[PDB]
Write an enzyme that holds these catalytic residues in place. Structure first.
Site, short mmCIF file in Angstrom:
data_model
loop_
_atom_site.label_atom_id
_atom_site.label_comp_id
_atom_site.label_asym_id
_atom_site.label_seq_id
_atom_site.Cartn_x
_atom_site.Cartn_y
_atom_site.Cartn_z
N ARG A 39 21.26 20.35 40.56
CA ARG A 39 22.54 20.28 41.26
C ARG A 39 23.52 19.41 40.48
O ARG A 39 24.61 19.85 40.11
CB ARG A 39 22.33 19.76 42.69
CG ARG A 39 21.57 20.71 43.65
CD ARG A 39 21.21 20.05 45.00
NE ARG A 39 20.42 18.83 44.87
CZ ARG A 39 19.97 18.11 45.89
NH1 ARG A 39 20.22 18.49 47.14
NH2 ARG A 39 19.26 17.00 45.68
N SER A 70 19.95 10.40 51.90
CA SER A 70 20.16 11.47 52.90
C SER A 70 19.25 11.33 54.11
O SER A 70 18.52 12.25 54.47
CB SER A 70 19.99 12.87 52.30
OG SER A 70 20.47 12.97 50.98
N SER A 84 22.77 18.48 54.35
CA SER A 84 23.06 17.05 54.27
C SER A 84 24.50 16.76 53.82
O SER A 84 24.96 15.62 53.96
CB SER A 84 22.02 16.42 53.35
OG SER A 84 20.74 17.05 53.55
CL LIG Z 1 21.79 15.25 57.68
#
Ligand SMILES: [Cl-]
Ligand SMILES: C[C@@H](O)[C@@H](C=O)[C@@H]1NC(C(=O)O)=C(S[C@@H]2CN[C@@H](C(=O)Nc3cccc(C(=O)O)c3)C2)[C@@H]1C
Ligand SMILES: [Ca+2]
Ligand SMILES: [Ca+2]
Ligand SMILES: [Ca+2]
Ligand SMILES: [Cl-]
Ligand SMILES: [Cl-]
Lengths: 243, 242
Positions: A228, A96, A48
């Protein structure tokens, strides 16, 4: 000067029982830093995080007229509940929303996609698979330090697309803001082809400097996704970039 | 149409203050306020004038872009954040008046007046000094006239370049998280009575934008944080933010 290793950052990975790389770039000083110089240059699927160049291309070519344009749900129910509605560029980035960007890629076309990625010097510049999923499971690959290189051009509006399109993508990357720092960034999570990893790339805006960043980490399951951001900002606090 | 909601006054009296909050739901084209008269009362914009001042400076090339550095003129001043170099982003965040006084002098009375007429900004009166009329001159603008100006800016419909408006809205960035984005500008009018503080801007959601403009009486500088504090409590009460 060059890139410094600093494996002390590994402790925030092992803290949370994890392994990955974090890469920082100081824009004032033109110096790099990472806990793992060799994973910094391992090229993976962008997943993404490909939404940054894909938005730039779609905007430059008029496939997306502006960040207010509405993109209609196609009617297929998908597992991520936030995808099953209408979206604009802002919200599609925020959640996303892959089906919206696959439609952009089809409309952009293989020839114009490949030309633009070469003009961006984006990773290995290979779009080998299908036109609407090569960044999820086809041939494209990009390293952490290759993400930084790309992001730096975007910050300075030096990519070969219109300035207006770069400003809009930079507006849509906005993730967090307060009195001390602004964060423009994008996440990813490459599942379709091993190794399952999660990304976070962006930059921190301070009063007087910009720090670019790009991390990736092993992501066997979807429940470690919050580390993350969480780990990255632990590194950021340690180097006193954010309070 | 316009709805009065006097319950908002609890958050003003909570804090020994008085003022007005004005909200505009863009999707529904309906506004709300705790005080309809004060909502339409015109005051000096003070540093909320940095929004249009920025737009004219950029549209005319007085400012190339948001990274161009503006040199500290050397003079030491009360607010410490002023005594350094700035770009547009920080000049707004810290309300650095000297930088904007310089923009205005290079803009000139003629172009400044033409732009404020084309913006339909407040009472469109720039009588006074070129470099301070928004502090102690003739310009006046109400909370509801701020909303009208800001809606045009949100939609890029002001008589300046799209690029100018995009840049100024980047520079207006104040807060952002997973729930909302606030682009806004503060002000504090002391040179002329009544002493008042301003906060004007908007809240971006996934599916709507709420424009807001507030002002309150500000007898001392110690109340200045109430500007954001009180606004945010109205937004919480109306379920615009958690
Ligand atoms: Cl994507
Ligand atoms: C004409 C100019 O002199 C005047 C124009 O309106 C300036 N604009 C402003 C302004 O803020 O608009 C200030 S005050 C100073 C800068 N901003 C205040 C502030 O952020 N204060 C602040 C910020 C966050 C929390 C709190 C607090 O009291 O809790 C206070 C402190 C200047 C006098
Ligand atoms: Ca830690
Ligand atoms: Ca309250
Ligand atoms: Ca008028
Ligand atoms: Cl000012
Ligand atoms: Cl922004």
């Amino acid at each position: 000067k060059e890139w410094q290793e600093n494996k002390s950052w590994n402790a925030h990975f092992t803290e949370h029982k994890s392994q990955g790389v974090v890469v920082l770039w100081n824009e004032n000083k033109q110096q790099g830093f990472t806990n793992n110089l060799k994973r910094a240059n391992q090229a993976f699927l962008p997943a993404s995080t490909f939404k940054i160049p894909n938005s730039l291309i779609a905007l430059d070519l008029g496939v997306v007229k502006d960040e207010h344009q509405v993109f209609k749900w196609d009617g297929q129910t998908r597992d991520i509940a936030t995808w099953n509605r209408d979206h604009n560029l802002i919200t599609a980035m925020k959640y996303s929303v892959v089906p919206v960007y696959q439609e952009f890629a089809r409309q952009i076309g293989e020839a114009r996609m490949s030309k633009m990625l070469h003009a961006f010097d984006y990773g290995n510049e290979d779009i080998s698979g299908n036109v609407d999923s090569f960044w999820l499971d086809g041939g494209i690959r990009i390293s952490a330090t290759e993400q930084i290189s790309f992001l730096r051009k975007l910050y300075h509006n030096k990519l070969h697309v219109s300035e207006r399109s770069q400003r809009i993508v930079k507006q849509a990357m906005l993730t967090e803001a307060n009195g001390d720092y602004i964060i423009r960034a994008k996440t990813g999570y490459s599942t379709r082809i091993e190794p399952k990893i999660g990304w976070w790339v962006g930059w921190v805006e301070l009063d007087d400097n910009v720090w670019f960043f790009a991390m990736n980490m092993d992501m066997p399951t979807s429940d470690g996704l919050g580390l993350r951001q969480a780990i990255t900002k632990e590194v950021l606090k340690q180097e006193k970039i954010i309070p």
